[PDB]
Amino acid sequence: LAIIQALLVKVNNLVYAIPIANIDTILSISKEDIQRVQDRDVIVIRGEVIPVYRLWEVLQIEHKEELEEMEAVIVRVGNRKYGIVVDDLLGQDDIVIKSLGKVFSEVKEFSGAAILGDGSIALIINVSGIV
Amino acid sequence: LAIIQALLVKVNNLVYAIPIANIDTILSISKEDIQRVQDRDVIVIRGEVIPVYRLWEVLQIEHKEELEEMEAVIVRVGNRKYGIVVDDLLGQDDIVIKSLGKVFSEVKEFSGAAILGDGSIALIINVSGIV
Amino acid sequence: LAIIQALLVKVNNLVYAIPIANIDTILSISKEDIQRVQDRDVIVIRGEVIPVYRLWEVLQIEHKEELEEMEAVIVRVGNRKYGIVVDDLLGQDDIVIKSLGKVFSEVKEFSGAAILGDGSIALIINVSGIV
Amino acid sequence: LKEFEVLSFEIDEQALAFDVDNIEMVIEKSDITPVPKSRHFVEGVINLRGRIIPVVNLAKILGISFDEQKMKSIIVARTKDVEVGFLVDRVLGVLRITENQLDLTNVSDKFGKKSKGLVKTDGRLIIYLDIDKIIEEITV
Amino acid sequence: LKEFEVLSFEIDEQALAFDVDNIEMVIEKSDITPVPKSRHFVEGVINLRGRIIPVVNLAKILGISFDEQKMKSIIVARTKDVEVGFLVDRVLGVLRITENQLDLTNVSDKFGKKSKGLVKTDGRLIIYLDIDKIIEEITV
Amino acid sequence: LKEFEVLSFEIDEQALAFDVDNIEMVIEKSDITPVPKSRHFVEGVINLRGRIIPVVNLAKILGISFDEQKMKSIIVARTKDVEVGFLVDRVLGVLRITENQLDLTNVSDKFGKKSKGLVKTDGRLIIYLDIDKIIEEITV
Numbered sequence: 001l002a003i004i005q006a007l008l009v010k011v012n013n014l015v016y017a018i019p020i021a022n023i024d025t026i027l028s029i030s031k032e033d034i035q036r037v038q039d040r041d042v043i044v045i046r047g048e049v050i051p052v053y054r055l056w057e058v059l060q061i062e063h064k065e066e067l068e069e070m071e072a073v074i075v076r077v078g079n080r081k082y083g084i085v086v087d088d089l090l091g092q093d094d095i096v097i098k099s100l101g102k103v104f105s106e107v108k109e110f111s112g113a114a115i116l117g118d119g120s121i122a123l124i125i126n127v128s129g130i131v
Numbered sequence: 132l133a134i135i136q137a138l139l140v141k142v143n144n145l146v147y148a149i150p151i152a153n154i155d156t157i158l159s160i161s162k163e164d165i166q167r168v169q170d171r172d173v174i175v176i177r178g179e180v181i182p183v184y185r186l187w188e189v190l191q192i193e194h195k196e197e198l199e200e201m202e203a204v205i206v207r208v209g210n211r212k213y214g215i216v217v218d219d220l221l222g223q224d225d226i227v228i229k230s231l232g233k234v235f236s237e238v239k240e241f242s243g244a245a246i247l248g249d250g251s252i253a254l255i256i257n258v259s260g261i262v
Numbered sequence: 263l264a265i266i267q268a269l270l271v272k273v274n275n276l277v278y279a280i281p282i283a284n285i286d287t288i289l290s291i292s293k294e295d296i297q298r299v300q301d302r303d304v305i306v307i308r309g310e311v312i313p314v315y316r317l318w319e320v321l322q323i324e325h326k327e328e329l330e331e332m333e334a335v336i337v338r339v340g341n342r343k344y345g346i347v348v349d350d351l352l353g354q355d356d357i358v359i360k361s362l363g364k365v366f367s368e369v370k371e372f373s374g375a376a377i378l379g380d381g382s383i384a385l386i387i388n389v390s391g392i393v
Numbered sequence: 394l395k396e397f398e399v400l401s402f403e404i405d406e407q408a409l410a411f412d413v414d415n416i417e418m419v420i421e422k423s424d425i426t427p428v429p430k431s432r433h434f435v436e437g438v439i440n441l442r443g444r445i446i447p448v449v450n451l452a453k454i455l456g457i458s459f460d461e462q463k464m465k466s467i468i469v470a471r472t473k474d475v476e477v478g479f480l481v482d483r484v485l486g487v488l489r490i491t492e493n494q495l496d497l498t499n500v501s502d503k504f505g506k507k508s509k510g511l512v513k514t515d516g517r518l519i520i521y522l523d524i525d526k527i528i529e530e531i532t533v
Numbered sequence: 534l535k536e537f538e539v540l541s542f543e544i545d546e547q548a549l550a551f552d553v554d555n556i557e558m559v560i561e562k563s564d565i566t567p568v569p570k571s572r573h574f575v576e577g578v579i580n581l582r583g584r585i586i587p588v589v590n591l592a593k594i595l596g597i598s599f600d601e602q603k604m605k606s607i608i609v610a611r612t613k614d615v616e617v618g619f620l621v622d623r624v625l626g627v628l629r630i631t632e633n634q635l636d637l638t639n640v641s642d643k644f645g646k647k648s649k650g651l652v653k654t655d656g657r658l659i660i661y662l663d664i665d666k667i668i669e670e671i672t673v
Numbered sequence: 674l675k676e677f678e679v680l681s682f683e684i685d686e687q688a689l690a691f692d693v694d695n696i697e698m699v700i701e702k703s704d705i706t707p708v709p710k711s712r713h714f715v716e717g718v719i720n721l722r723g724r725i726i727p728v729v730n731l732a733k734i735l736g737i738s739f740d741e742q743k744m745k746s747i748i749v750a751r752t753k754d755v756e757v758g759f760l761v762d763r764v765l766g767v768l769r770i771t772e773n774q775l776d777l778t779n780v781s782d783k784f785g786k787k788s789k790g791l792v793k794t795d796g797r798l799i800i801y802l803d804i805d806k807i808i809e810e811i812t813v
Contacts, residue, residue, distance in 0.1 A: 014567070035798050036687045038737070038781040038788070044796050049778045059569035080779070100568065100578055102615050102672040103587045109570050119580050121566040145427070166658050167547045169597070169641040169648070175656050180638045190429035211639070231428065231438055233475050233532040234447045240430050250440050252426040276707070297518050298407045300457070300501040300508070306516050311498045321709035342499070362708065362718055364755050364812040365727045371710050381720050383706040 002097045006114075007073060008090035008122060011056050012063055015122040016086075017095055017114055022127045024074040024081050026089070031068050043083060050074060052083035058130050059109065063087075075127045084130070097124060133228045137245075138204060139221035139253060142187050143194055146253040147217075148226055148245055153258045155205040155212050157220070162199050174214060181205060183214035189261050190240065194218075206258045215261070228255060264359045268376075269335060270352035270384060273318050274325055277384040278348075279357055279376055284389045286336040286343050288351070293330050305345060312336060314345035320392050321371065325349075337389045346392070359386060394491045399512075401485040401519055402468065404452045405459050409481075410488065410512070411524035415470040419484050422448075422467050434531075436480055441469065448478035449531065455504060472525045475532060488514065495521065534631045539652075541625040541659055542608065544592045545599050549621075550628065550652070551664035555610040559624050562588075562607050574671075576620055581609065588618035589671065595644060612665045615672060628654065635661065674771045679792075681765040681799055682748065684732045685739050689761075690768065690792070691804035695750040699764050702728075702747050714811075716760055721749065728758035729811065735784060752805045755812060768794065775801065 006017040007026075027045070029052070034041050040051045052072060056063040072085045095114035100123070104110070111126035137148040138157075158176070160183070165172050171182045183203060187194040203216045226245035231254070235241070242257035268279040269288075289307070291314070296303050302313045314334060318325040334347045357376035362385070366372070373388035400419075401410040425437040425448050434453035438445050448467055452459035459482070467478040496511040507530070509521040540559075541550040565577040565588050574593035578585050588607055592599035599622070607618040636651040647670070649661040680699075681690040705717040705728050714733035718725050728747055732739035739762070747758040776791040787810070789801040 036737075037791070037798060037800065038735075038783040040781045042780060042798070044793065044798065047793060047796065049776055049780065049791060049793075049798070051780050061569060098585050100585050101587055103575060103589065103617065104568060104571055105673055107568065107571050110568070113566075113578060113585050115580055115583060115585070119583075121578060121580055121585070123566075123568060167597075168651070168658060168660065169595075169643040171641045173640060173658070175653065175658065178653060178656065180636055180640065180651060180653075180658070182640050192429060229445050231445050232447055234435060234449065234477065235428060235431055236533055238428065238431050241428070244426075244438060244445050246440055246443060246445070250443075252438060252440055252445070254426075254428060298457075299511070299518060299520065300455075300503040302501045304500060304518070306513065306518065309513060309516065311496055311500065311511060311513075311518070313500050323709060360725050362725050363727055365715060365729065365757065366708060366711055367813055369708065369711050372708070375706075375718060375725050377720055377723060377725070381723075383718060383720055383725070385706075385708060 003094055004097055005092065005094050006124065008093050008116075009055070009073065009086045010088035010090050011059070011061055011086060014061070015090065015116070015120060016055065017093075017122040017124045018073055018075065018084075018127065019124065020092065022075045022077075024076045026071070026073055028069060029072050029083075029085075031066070031070070050081060050083050052085055053130065054085045056087075058084075077128045084125075095122065095124075134225055135228055136223065136225050137255065139224050139247075140186070140204065140217045141219035141221050142190070142192055142217060145192070146221065146247070146251060147186065148224075148253040148255045149204055149206065149215075149258065150255065151223065153206045153208075155207045157202070157204055159200060160203050160214075160216075162197070162201070181212060181214050183216055184261065185216045187218075189215075208259045215256075226253065226255075265356055266359055267354065267356050268386065270355050270378075271317070271335065271348045272350035272352050273321070273323055273348060276323070277352065277378070277382060278317065279355075279384040279386045280335055280337065280346075280389065281386065282354065284337045284339075286338045288333070288335055290331060291334050291345075291347075293328070293332070312343060312345050314347055315392065316347045318349075320346075339390045346387075357384065357386075394493055397490040397492065399488050399490060399521065400468065401488050402466065402481045403483050403485055404455075404457060404481050405463060407457055408485065408517075408519045409451075409522055410519050411468075411470065411522045411527075413487060415472060415524045417469045417471060417476070420467050420469065420478075422465050422480060439467070439478060441478075444476075446476055446478050448480055451479040451481055451527075454527065454531065455507065470524055470528075472528045475528055477528055477531065488512070488519070534633055537630040537632065539628050539630060539661065540608065541628050542606065542621045543623050543625055544595075544597060544621050545603060547597055548625065548657075548659045549591075549662055550659050551608075551610065551662045551667075553627060555612060555664045557609045557611060557616070560607050560609065560618075562605050562620060579607070579618060581618075584616075586616055586618050588620055591619040591621055591667075594667065594671065595647065610664055610668075612668045615668055617668055617671065628652070628659070674773055677770040677772065679768050679770060679801065680748065681768050682746065682761045683763050683765055684735075684737060684761050685743060687737055688765065688797075688799045689731075689802055690799050691748075691750065691802045691807075693767060695752060695804045697749045697751060697756070700747050700749065700758075702745050702760060719747070719758060721758075724756075726756055726758050728760055731759040731761055731807075734807065734811065735787065750804055750808075752808045755808055757808055757811065768792070768799070 005020045009016050042051050070085050071089050072083045097112045100113045108129035110123045112124045114122045136151045140147050173182050201216050202220050203214045228243045231244045239260035241254045243255045245253045267282045271278050304313050332347050333351050334345045359374045362375045370391035372385045374386045376384045398413040399410040427437045434450050436448045463482045464480045469478045506526045509523045512519045538553040539550040567577045574590050576588045603622045604620045609618045646666045649663045652659045678693040679690040707717045714730050716728045743762045744760045749758045786806045789803045792799045
């Protein structure tokens, strides 16, 4: 079996799993200090410029309550790293990657699903496929 | 002259002439037992599956009163036959096919017009041009 | 310097300059005797058929009060001549053609601007570029 | 020159005419039978003297504006074998003309070869139409 | 001939069926997890017997109409390695059939090779679907 | 390195700057004469020191958002022969900089070669614009 440790994260009631191997850190940013750069939004932390992506916007999920303080996973693809705002920080966990089959062949945003403890589903974010 | 015997049929106030040479029978079907097959509607009579076409829909004519019992001419093109629902069953008649000229060159749905007794017009259905 | 004498003309509050070298005459036409020809409007004066163009329509400028009597400059491009209705007939004047630069490279309707007495701008109509 | 006879009519605020040799008769728009699934500018067929004649909307063919309430006349013309009824507002009368009161100013390019020129009468314009070229266009 | 067993179901006013050898089980539509940014006809994935199975809207795949309130059943079928849940209104039962009560009239071309023919039962039509060809279509 | 002087301004919630050597002067948006049938991003021409200068909407050229009520300043810059007034919200001041506080992270590709990089000042970003390349783009 293919085990992998991952951060369980939430958008509304949906569960996404970001493999821990890709997380750089986890901060709590405040609307107050996001900056508009061109078409993208960034935070700068310790002089490092990191573009932030809301996860619901990245996945096109209906959602509105954009709070003043929000939790955000920073991930890293090669040598560029970038933020991912989420709703809830569920917890760290050990999951078994199952493939979600031939009908999702084209979905670059994910890389498989996991069945959790209570038998609910999490889909695994493919960090190098979320722009 | 080119005489031809034909069923005179009505949609609202318009008169269409179906050459009798092409009619197979004339039944009275009831909404109750039309069946949806794919995108087409059919009746099955004596195990024979016949697709029905409303004549106003085939000709795009405004019309709404789709009664529970309706009269329908079954016609035959080669070896496939198919129904044609109409409003009124005017009567059988002997008409002279006149050509409706060079400006209707493209209209596959008809094959000429007739001048009736009272000098009103009927257009002759071209059964092999009504899909 | 490039001096040129020109008719100063108005549409709403905007000032356009038609070089006098291109004017044939200046009449006052009345809605009453414009004639629709195909898609174009014409007046006929002394058996001569002259298409009239409203200047605001030619330049797409918001404007509505199309009075019953209106003032119109007739201009001449080669051997065809044509009318140009305007709002006000400001006056004849001597202006210095200045080029309106590289960002207007494509605007066929004009051929430069002038700075007037009070330092306001007039743009010079290019009669052979107003259809 | 040569003496020309034409029929002048009106399609709302705009006056036109074609060569009288092609007209059979001018009847009143009474009753027209639709011919489903035909071009947008054909109105239908009429029964006239026991023959089928297609009636078309001349305004729609030329591309000028018209008001349906006013389409009251049908000019029935023919070229060679083909016969056609053109629906217009009102007939105005016959005009006797000469190819020298025939102004050829290029006011527009809209009507293609359908236009033959302007005819100035008291300084009042009338478009001279090439009836054959209209029928040619309208067939195949 | 040959004896055929098929599963008949309804997608609103229209009755269909596929070969019973391909069905694993028919469960009740309970709970489906969306898979963002996937094709329009996939509803999502479900957890069934500890495995991930995609659930698709059969109506959307065929192109016939459906009412969401009524999509209550999931037929879980498989061909070769690929396993899929088709969302339908209601299962109607099993039918035992023979390729001679299998009417092949060409009523329409909409369902491509997805259709295998009509089955007439008491003069009451049921479309026989090629389940493999539906799955083949739906994968790559 | 090298010492760089730039002019920083704001187009609503977003701060930008270009090389000070190209600026002639910063005037207040007063009065602009429209030039009909010109590109969507040109506002028009102004009379400044007895010469004609085109004024363009920098936001529209870059593609960022702006509020018309706030476009209050005009930065008049020139490259070679071509002179242009860029309409912005407010000027913020001059900044003295060095190509090593010049962050080149690839945050986006929207501004093409119009962008020269970020300048971090107290951890507060400002986009450094290539003024020449903006003018080059805007001419032919």
